[PDB]
Enzyme design. Structure first.
Site, PDB file in Angstrom:
ATOM      1  N   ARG A 156      21.322  12.367  67.478  1.00 19.28           N
ATOM      2  CA  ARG A 156      21.453  12.700  66.067  1.00 19.28           C
ATOM      3  C   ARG A 156      20.196  12.361  65.278  1.00 19.28           C
ATOM      4  O   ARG A 156      20.239  12.310  64.045  1.00 19.28           O
ATOM      5  CB  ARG A 156      22.674  11.996  65.490  1.00 19.28           C
ATOM      6  CG  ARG A 156      23.946  12.398  66.192  1.00 19.28           C
ATOM      7  CD  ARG A 156      25.169  11.697  65.636  1.00 19.28           C
ATOM      8  NE  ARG A 156      26.348  11.966  66.451  1.00 19.28           N
ATOM      9  CZ  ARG A 156      27.533  12.292  65.958  1.00 19.28           C
ATOM     10  NH1 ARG A 156      27.700  12.382  64.653  1.00 19.28           N
ATOM     11  NH2 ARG A 156      28.551  12.523  66.768  1.00 19.28           N
TER      12      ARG A 156
HETATM   13  N1  LIG Z   1      22.584  24.269  63.264  1.00 23.08           N
HETATM   14  C1  LIG Z   1      22.322  23.405  64.270  1.00 23.08           C
HETATM   15  N2  LIG Z   1      21.317  23.648  65.129  1.00 23.08           N
HETATM   16  C2  LIG Z   1      21.034  22.808  66.133  1.00 23.08           C
HETATM   17  N3  LIG Z   1      21.712  21.679  66.370  1.00 23.08           N
HETATM   18  C3  LIG Z   1      22.747  21.313  65.588  1.00 23.08           C
HETATM   19  C4  LIG Z   1      23.117  22.174  64.465  1.00 23.08           C
HETATM   20  N4  LIG Z   1      24.158  21.582  63.861  1.00 23.08           N
HETATM   21  C5  LIG Z   1      24.424  20.440  64.542  1.00 23.08           C
HETATM   22  N5  LIG Z   1      23.580  20.276  65.571  1.00 23.08           N
HETATM   23  C6  LIG Z   1      23.564  19.152  66.543  1.00 23.08           C
HETATM   24  O1  LIG Z   1      24.651  18.253  66.341  1.00 23.08           O
HETATM   25  C7  LIG Z   1      24.205  16.918  66.551  1.00 23.08           C
HETATM   26  C8  LIG Z   1      24.935  15.963  65.636  1.00 23.08           C
HETATM   27  O2  LIG Z   1      26.195  16.509  65.298  1.00 23.08           O
HETATM   28  P1  LIG Z   1      26.833  16.068  63.904  1.00 23.08           P
HETATM   29  O3  LIG Z   1      26.709  17.212  62.942  1.00 23.08           O
HETATM   30  O4  LIG Z   1      26.260  14.728  63.544  1.00 23.08           O
HETATM   31  O5  LIG Z   1      28.374  15.886  64.298  1.00 23.08           O
HETATM   32  P2  LIG Z   1      29.427  15.523  63.154  1.00 23.08           P
HETATM   33  O6  LIG Z   1      29.329  16.731  62.271  1.00 23.08           O
HETATM   34  O7  LIG Z   1      30.730  15.387  63.894  1.00 23.08           O
HETATM   35  O8  LIG Z   1      28.909  14.252  62.528  1.00 23.08           O
HETATM   36  C9  LIG Z   1      22.731  16.903  66.215  1.00 23.08           C
HETATM   37  O9  LIG Z   1      22.005  16.110  67.150  1.00 23.08           O
HETATM   38  C10 LIG Z   1      22.299  18.338  66.348  1.00 23.08           C
HETATM   39  O10 LIG Z   1      21.474  18.439  67.509  1.00 23.08           O
END
Ligand SMILES: Nc1ncnc2c1ncn2[C@@H]1O[C@H](COP(=O)(O)OP(=O)(O)O)[C@@H](O)[C@H]1O
Ligand SMILES: Nc1ncnc2c1ncn2[C@@H]1O[C@H](COP(=O)(O)OP(=O)(O)OP(=O)(O)O)[C@@H](O)[C@H]1O
Ligand SMILES: Nc1ncnc2c1ncn2[C@@H]1O[C@H](COP(=O)(O)OP(=O)(O)OP(=O)(O)O)[C@@H](O)[C@H]1O
Ligand SMILES: CC(C)C[C@@H]1NC(=O)[C@H](C)N(C)C(=O)CNC(=O)/C(=C/c2ccccc2)N(C)C1=O
Lengths: 478, 179, 70, 500, 480
Positions: free
Chosen positions: D362
């Site tokens: 993340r």
């Molecule tokens: N549009 C996107 N493009 C590439 N990777 C994404 C995208 N959206 C989320 N990710 C991936 O999701 C990972 C983290 O997910 P996250 O959004 O934190 O989960 P949550 O929404 O459950 O907190 C990141 O490391 C990222 O690589």
């Protein structure tokens, strides 16, 4: 004067004893109820203090039967925890959870005795000697090597071959074992007990005359024993083995069969004691109750305890808490399968699941390590293609896929080996085959020089030469 | 304390308080304690196989002969009625603490190697009253020869808080060396 | 450590124990939280009967227990 | 000189005879398996240590109405019913100083190596608040692991939580140990907390560290399966406080919890021995708060706080790959990305068995440098899409040439990510490897000669050309000049590998 | 205030305090425990009465840490629910559960405060307008058209991208929105909140130079906090936004993350309070808890609260009670699938499971509706065929079957997009994609104009001309 108390509650093994206002016993002290059976005084009714329930009374679990104990029995306090005979007097004898010789022979000498409750050995007193050990079981010698000095586990369901496997290991090792072995049965068949005792006699290990020299001490709590007994017979055998180690400075073996009955007895005791239950039925203190047993088994700077502990996996579920906590403690696990046992591939070791920690080149040699990785690779690929072949058949696979599948069939059949102790069921004389032939045979099978041979040539043979001879027979019978 | 003993005891003490007959009830409670100490009394009154009628009848005769405050006789009838009669000894125990906390007469227990004089008794009473803020201080006297030479006083709603100096000195001076 | 025994009801009974008298005219609120309220008295209330708390909060007497109306 | 030191001790004694204080002391009521209901003690805090008659420490957790539920920090054998217990006046303080570097210790910060007590003046609490929103800054440094997969695709940064989740014997301890051992030239403090593990396993770990050199900057907060539940529960928090002492004083730290499931199991045990209500599958409800309170203390402190760091890399175990379990989903929720290790990839040869398709980070490129970001920004998405393209093109009989070449290049990429045990890769080797792979040079030679050619190429750049390493070190950017040098070198080594 | 209580039982954040006989606090009122800091000074710990439990005792949940708080301590009865400062003194400021400033700046202007526990608006008070807004995400703006002035939902496990999706949505909608945005952080990571704050600083949203010029107010219920804060920060941020909509009568953006942690905290606190555990472990008061949040969050005649909130789904099981319960209150729902996240298609919005209430002809236009229906149809054909193909082989399908398979794979690629904030994750720059561009591109890809381009040319492209240019680039790369 040992302080004396009466009994208040009797609910199975749980015994709540009222003790004088001032002097209560401590945790794990040997309580001895007086007891009044048919004609005389059965003082044998022995407890241990488990809790302290306030208002000058404690809770005990019975290592014997409880039926017949009326309210008001006088109870003494030993003042020291349960102590069992240790040393050379124990060699060649059968004991109990209580250390009372049921060997139907003379009494045992109480000069040197050791409590069943002892702290784990310190961190300075361990050792880091990485040591290999061959068993002659091909799959054990190749895909999950055993560690001298460390604990080993026979994880399997019921009727799969843990007892035959451990008996084969006993025949292979404990015979020529230069040290002194201790066999402890935590909740197994009295039939198996008598059979092992008869074999230990007739084979000469427990010498009939001259019981001073036997190198083996039996400690048995069977499956008809109350849970208080089946929860401490393991500790008894453990104190004898660790006396041998710590005092006489010898390497010791300890075949426990099987610790799942230890765990189960613990659960049966805890439900009675009234603790809040942990996962679905087990005791809350399962991890600590298991670790208190396990961490006393490890080798130390004087002697080495190489224990081989069968584990019964309930309903063939590796997810259950007692396997889930034993897998952590053991050094090398050997996972048997009911599937292989039904298909006849004996021993029923799951090759990919049985993962040792010693299968490392620095310990086992680069050739051994490399052939083990290649066998694991090919068996993995066949495990993957199983889903396809179930519905389709081997015909629909690629050239390399069908190659790997044929090699994996030959491999999973060559892993099989007839045992000396299974000779009564198979009829075929068990073969002993060590590492020098194991590695070579597997090198050949994975090279594919023996690709012309059928599958049944590798089934139930010890050497690759015997496999090839059986193949020559299968081509003599046109 | 949420124990049914403490509940009933505080209820009885508040009844006696709103009457103004606190000491008159306290005497009768000292009497009821030594009544229920005798085991056939408490056993007959507590075991359920014994009829509630003759339970209350023997209770009536005990009321008449011993002599009890009207509301306290009413309350022992209440216990026999509502079956807290197993908690009778516990209620007669907790009534002391609820009375002490109604009155401000905090009981502080001093234990020395020997008995002490009224001068030291008034000294520790003044000490306890200044450090707690209790309207009264009544002192229990108990001997403790296990101490070497010194006085040990406890106090609090329960005997939780405590200052002590006989052997504490020996332990603290051996520990700072065997550290 | 019992419900319905609030050490004020025991006071009221110690005052008025003489014989067990009907108390349905009255009713007090012992324990109240998360949408329910244990109620003393009301010894002739039916099951399902609307019981009207002071301040205007209607309730329904669902499970009549030993000495308290849930 | 036995008398003169005794003379100083006696000079202390004449001044140390008695201190007056209202020690709150209560009577013991029930003693069973590590939990002791206590009477009295009404002015004790929450979580205040009590000291019994035996010397056994406790912690006053449940301040009930009548009694005081107290967990013992050890055995309850010698604690006699009715004996008195005194409160201390402290709440889980531990001594902490620089001496702990190299010293395996118990959860009570007691040296189980037997090398003498730890010279520790300053004391920090076991439980501390987490750094607030403004007491941190965004993670921007990388924390090098040595593994090409973790260092490129799912990066870890200084001040980030990253969970190592997987099955048994799938290399989680090895991943943590290699991540620690790669730190020998980066000057960070290492902490390896071991919760409910084999004493022999801990002995192997400390032997490996001591003989590899990783003990000059490492501590081991270990207690085994025999140890009490409350010690198995306090070990991670004590390790966290030990790390945080350095973290506040302008240091970079790295703490590993191997494992966390044993801590949650011990906390479940003591919760169920205190008769607390069991939630779903015997775990109490507050186990999420249990893990989050511990994990949210690993952060990247701001410039005002000295820009200290603490990277937490906890280790959990999933059973048969059941991520849907309670504690697995709790930890993958709390941590900042996770690294899933699969026994499938382990058996099939892929070692370390990083399953990147269900692994995340993340922080992203902010846990790398400009050079590795330029070389591998798109690599994770392209590798997942190629895992699809190679998994889906088993159904089609004949492929078009573009897809076939992408499939071959993805297979080369899969052969690149194999990393042996106890082998770290530097940033120069990682950059040059990802370049020579992604840019399509290994499309020709076979999947088995891939790895040997990689070894030979890195050996070649090390012997011949130092300015590549000099550039990627001093400038930290995969410049056109460094790429020119690298392409020259790759061509030379490809020709050499051909002729040989 | 005058009636002082005594701490009687402390079991974690679930406390028991006794009061004088007839002066007892009210349910949901606030209690201030006169605590003690380690140095002897007081350390005031707030509570909130949950349950009047008899004998002058009340059970109150502590909004702070309970450690260090001995028995018999002093407690007050404030006489009010937890009140929070509302109005313009909240803009640009980070808060707590209790409305305290924690950005280490000036103390807020207390002057306007409004108690957290208040009622929902009445049925006559509801605004019934139906309109969609443009969010700049292809899959969203085509298949799940969000409802301006309603409640939206982000469902998925962890790591599938709902926090990044909510950051993308913040980026697109916050500054274009002429009113004030509100962000309630509930049970989310402190570094997540800090990165959001640093982005809101650098992007000039808060305008730090002139406070009370910001268009944003921040409430963070992080995961280190006890269950009280994780329960009540949602209601705090809701009361702030409800003031903004009530009297400042402007449209509001109310992003919530994570909303599952509120029900999580309720479930943690339930069993210890005295409630019997319901199914898999949630409180009995789950449906009414979610009601007391959602039904308070609604658009009225005066103001319109647009709330883009993200629901965590434990172990990707939509059968889990709290995700199951939020679904009934969320108008437009999008479900993230670990398959789409793991394969590399980002954003990972599972299209066939994601549904909106706005996707109706009269509202979205007949062309938008027909193209949405055709996209869903081709994807559903593909998924109903995929396992049959996986067993059988691909050759043995008909012309139209293989055709729709290829088109559906290409559409699965084209519903991916590079996000503006996901640059560190992808490497490419984020593209804002308009609704006209999306509809046109999907019309083309469905009609089969592009029926010879590489499927990989449709991967991480914003528009459709970008996909054509990427096809050109791959075509030239193959020719070299
Ligand atoms: N549009 C996107 N493009 C590439 N990777 C994404 C995208 N959206 C989320 N990710 C991936 O999701 C990972 C983290 O997910 P996250 O959004 O934190 O989960 P949550 O929404 O459950 O907190 C990141 O490391 C990222 O690589
Ligand atoms: N080497 C072998 N050859 C043939 N059969 C075998 C072999 N090993 C095990 N078996 C089969 O396994 C069955 C019993 O195995 P065993 O008693 O060793 O395991 P178990 O039942 O789990 O032991 P226990 O019940 O004592 O724990 C027998 O019916 C036997 O046919
Ligand atoms: N990078 C690697 N390359 C080759 N082998 C490896 C690598 N990492 C781990 N292994 C092998 O994996 C085996 C088990 O590793 P490890 O002990 O880390 O697993 P674990 O998760 O700690 O197991 P447990 O669940 O019992 O703790 C070791 O024998 C080691 O040889
Ligand atoms: C009919 C048998 C079971 C007698 C019992 N004996 C036992 O179960 C064994 C021998 N144990 C553990 C005892 O010593 C007696 N306690 C009981 O468990 C029991 C268990 C029991 C429960 C319900 C009905 C009968 C018995 N005793 C009552 C026994 O005496």
């Amino acid at each position: 004067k040992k302080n004396l108390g009466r009994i208040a509650q009797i609910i199975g093994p749980v015994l709540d004893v009222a003790f004088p206002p001032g002097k209560m016993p401590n945790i794990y002290n040997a309580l001895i109820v007086k007891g009044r059976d048919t004609a005389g005084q059965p003082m044998n009714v022995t407890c241990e203090v488990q809790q302290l329930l306030g208002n000058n009374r404690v809770r005990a679990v019975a290592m014997s039967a409880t039926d017949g104990l009326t309210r008001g029995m006088e109870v003494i306090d030993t003042g020291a925890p349960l102590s069992v005979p240790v040393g050379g007097a124990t060699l060649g004898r059968i004991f109990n959870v209580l250390g009372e010789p049921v060997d139907n022979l003379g009494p045992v000498d109480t000069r040197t005795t050791s409590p069943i409750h002892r702290s784990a050995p310190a961190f300075t007193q361990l050792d880091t000697k990485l040591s290999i050990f061959e068993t002659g079981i091909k799959v054990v010698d190749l895909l999950a090597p055993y560690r001298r000095g460390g604990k080993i586990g026979l994880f399997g369901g019921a009727g799969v071959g843990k007892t035959v496997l451990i008996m084969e290991l006993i025949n292979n090792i404990a015979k020529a074992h230069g040290g002194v072995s201790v066999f402890g049965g935590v909740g197994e068949r009295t039939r198996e007990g008598n059979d092992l005792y008869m074999e230990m006699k007739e084979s000469g290990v427990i010498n009939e005359q001259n019981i001073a020299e036997s190198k083996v001490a039996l400690v048995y709590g069977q499956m008809n024993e109350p849970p208080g007994a089946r929860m401490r017979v393991g500790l008894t055998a453990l104190t004898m083995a660790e006396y041998f180690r710590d005092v006489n400075e010898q390497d010791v073996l300890l075949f426990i069969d099987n610790i799942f009955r230890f765990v189960q007895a613990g659960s049966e005791v805890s439900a009675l004691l009234g603790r809040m239950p942990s996962a679905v039925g087990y005791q809350p203190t399962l991890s600590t109750e298991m670790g208190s047993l396990q961490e006393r088994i490890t080798s130390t700077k004087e002697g080495s305890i190489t224990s081989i502990q069968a584990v019964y996996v309930p309903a063939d579920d590796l997810t259950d808490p007692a396997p889930a906590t034993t897998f952590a403690h053991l050094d090398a696990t050997t996972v048997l399968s009911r599937g292989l046992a039904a298909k006849g591939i004996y021993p029923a070791v799951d090759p990919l699941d049985s993962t040792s920690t010693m299968l490392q080149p620095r310990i086992v040699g680069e050739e051994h390590y490399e052939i083990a990785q290649r066998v694991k690779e090919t068996l993995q690929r066949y495990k993957e293609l199983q889903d396809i072949i179930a519905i389709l058949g081997l015909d629909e696979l690629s050239e390399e896929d069908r190659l790997t599948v044929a090699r994996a069939r030959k491999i999973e059949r060559f892993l099989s080996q007839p045992f000396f102790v299974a000779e009564v069921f198979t009829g075929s004389p068990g073969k002993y085959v060590g590492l020098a032939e194991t590695i070579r045979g597997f090198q050949l099978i994975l090279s594919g020089e023996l690709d012309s041979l059928p599958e049944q040539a590798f089934y139930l043979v010890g050497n690759i030469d015997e496999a090839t001879a059986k193949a020559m027979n299968l081509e003599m019978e046109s | 304390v949420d124990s049914t003993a403490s509940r009933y005891a505080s209820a009885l003490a508040d009844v006696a308080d709103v009457t103004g007959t606190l000491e008159a009830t306290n005497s009768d409670v000292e009497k009821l304690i030594r009544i229920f100490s005798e085991e056939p009394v408490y056993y007959f009154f507590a075991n359920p196989v014994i009829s509630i009628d003759n339970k209350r009848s023997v209770l009536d005769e005990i009321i008449t002969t011993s002599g009890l405050q009207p509301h306290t006789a009413n309350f022992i009838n209440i216990l026999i009625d509502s079956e807290r009669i197993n908690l009778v000894k516990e209620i007669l125990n907790e009534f002391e603490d609820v009375f002490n906390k109604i009155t401000g007469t905090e009981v502080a227990v001093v234990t020395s190697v020997v008995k002490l004089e009224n001068d030291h008794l008034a000294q520790i009473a003044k000490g306890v009253q200044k450090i707690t803020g209790a309207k009264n201080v009544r002192i229990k006297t108990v001997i403790d020869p296990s101490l070497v030479a010194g006085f040990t006083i406890r106090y609090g709603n329960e005997g939780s808080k405590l200052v002590d100096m006989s052997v504490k000195k020996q332990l603290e001076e051996i520990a700072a060396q065997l550290e | 450590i019992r419900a319905d025994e609030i050490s004020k009801i025991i006071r009221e009974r110690i005052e008025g124990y003489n014989r067990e008298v009907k108390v349905v005219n009255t009713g007090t609120v012992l324990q109240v939280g998360d949408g329910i309220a244990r109620i003393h008295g009301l010894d002739e209330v039916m099951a399902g009967e609307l019981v009207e708390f002071e301040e205007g909060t209607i309730g329904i007497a669902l499970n009549l227990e030993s000495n308290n109306v849930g | 000189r036995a008398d003169e030191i005794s003379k100083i001790i006696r000079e202390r004694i004449e001044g140390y005879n008695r201190e007056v204080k209202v020690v709150n002391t209560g009577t013991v009521l029930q003693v069973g398996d590590g939990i002791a209901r206590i009477h009295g003690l009404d002015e004790v805090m929450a979580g205040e240590l009590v000291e019994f008659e035996e010397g056994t420490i406790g912690i006053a957790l449940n301040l009930e109405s009548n009694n005081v539920g107290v967990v013992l920090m050890g055995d309850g054998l010698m604690i006699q019913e009715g004996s008195s217990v005194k409160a201390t006046g402290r709440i889980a303080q531990i001594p902490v100083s620089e001496a702990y570097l190299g010293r395996v210790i118990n959860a009570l910060a007691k040296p189980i190596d037997g090398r003498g007590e730890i010279t520790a003046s300053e004391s920090r609490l076991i439980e501390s608040p987490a750094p607030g929103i403004m007491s941190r800054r965004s993670v921007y440094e990388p924390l090098q692991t040595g593994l090409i997969a973790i260092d490129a695709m799912i990066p870890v940064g200084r001040g980030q939580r990253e969970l190592i989740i997987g099955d048994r014997q799938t290399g989680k301890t090895a991943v943590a140990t290699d991540t620690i051992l790669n730190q020998q030239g980066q000057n960070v403090i290492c902490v390896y907390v071991a919760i409910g593990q084999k004493a022999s396993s801990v002995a192997q770990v400390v032997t490996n560290f001591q003989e590899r050199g990783a003990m000059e900057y490492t501590i081991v907060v270990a207690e085994t399966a025999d140890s009490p539940a409350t010690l198995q529960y306090l070990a991670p928090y004590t390790g966290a406080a030990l790390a945080e002492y350095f973290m506040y004083r302008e240091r970079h730290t790295l703490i590993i919890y191997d494992d966390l499931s044993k801590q949650a199991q011990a906390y479940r045990q003591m919760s169920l021995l205190l008769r607390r209500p069991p939630g779903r599958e015997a775990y109490p409800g507050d186990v999420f708060y249990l893990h989050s309170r511990l994990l949210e203390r690993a952060a990247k402190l701001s410039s005002l706080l000295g820009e200290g760091s603490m990277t937490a890399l906890p280790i959990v175990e999933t059973q048969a790959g059941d991520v849907s379990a309670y504690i697995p989903t709790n930890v993958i929720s709390i941590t900042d990305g996770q690294i899933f290790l699969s026994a499938d990839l382990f058996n099939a040869g892929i070692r370390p068995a990083i399953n990147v398709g269900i692994s995340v980070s993340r922080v992203g490129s902010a846990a790398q440098i400009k050079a590795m970001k330029k070389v591998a920004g798109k690599l994770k998405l392209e590798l997942a899409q190629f895992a699809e393209l190679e998994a889906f093109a088993q159904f089609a009989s004949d492929l078009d040439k573009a897809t076939q070449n992408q499939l071959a290049r993805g297979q080369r990429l899969r052969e690149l990510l194999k990393q042996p045990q106890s082998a770290p890769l530097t940033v120069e080797e990682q950059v040059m490897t990802i370049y020579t792979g992604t840019n399509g040079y290994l499309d020709s030679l076979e999947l088995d000669q891939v790895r040997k050619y990689l070894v030979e190429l890195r050996t070649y750049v090390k012997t011949n050309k130092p300015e590549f390493q000099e550039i990627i070190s001093s400038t930290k950017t995969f410049t056109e000049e460094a790429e020119a040098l690298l392409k020259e070198a790759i061509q030379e080594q490809m020709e050499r590998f051909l002729l040989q």
